[PDB]
């Protein structure tokens, strides 16, 4: 049924989950936070920032 | 003790495209770095 199956014997860890329980917080750190900040700077005309 | 050697590598130092931009060797890594040592004898074990 499979094209291939392999055991990843060198993998003891995995990437942080942006769909998981703490995704909320990561989402605010990486996307929402900077979008909030940019919007404010735009309103205040600090275009470069 | 003797040498401070990183245990793994995930961050690339460089990369590039293959011919005609149709492929790339990319996001590879070094899951494990082990080492042994003796005076003037440093042995690095890399599992890339």
How far off is chain B from A37, nearest CA to CA, in Å? 28
Q: Give A15-20 contacts, CB < 8 A, sequence gap 24+.
A: none
Angle, alpha carbons A17-A23-A27 (nearest 5°): 115
d(CA A16, CA A24) in angstroms, rounded, equals 12
Give the position of tokens 């995930």.
Answer: B10
Mutation target among B7, B27, B29, B31 for the A interface, most CBs of A within 10 A: B31
Q: Is residue B33 within 8 Å of B5, Cβ to Cβ?
A: yes
d(CA B30, CA B2) in angstroms, rounded, equals 22
Please, where are the H alpha helices in chain A?
23-27, 33-43
- Which of A6, B11, A14, B34 is CA-nearest to residue B47? B34
Resolution (A): 4.0
Mutation target among A9, A10, A13, A15 for the B interface, most CBs of B within 10 A: A10
Residues of chain A in contact with residue B32, where contact means CB-CB under 8 angstroms, are 10
> Encoding tokens for residue B19?
């011919």
d(CA B28, CA B39) in angstroms, rounded, equals 32
């Amino acid at each position: 049924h499979f094209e291939s199956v392999n055991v990843l014997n060198n993998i003891s860890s995995e990437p942080m989950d942006f769909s998981g329980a703490n995704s909320l917080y990561f989402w605010e750190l990486f996307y929402y936070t900077p979008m909030l900040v940019a919007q404010r700077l735009l309103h205040e005309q600090n275009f470069d920032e | 003790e003797d040498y401070e050697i990183p245990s793994s590598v995930s961050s690339r130092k460089d990369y590039g495209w293959g011919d005609y931009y149709l492929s790339m060797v990319y996001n590879g890594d070094i899951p494990t770095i082990n080492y042994k040592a003796a005076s003037s004898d440093l042995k690095i074990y890399i599992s890339p």
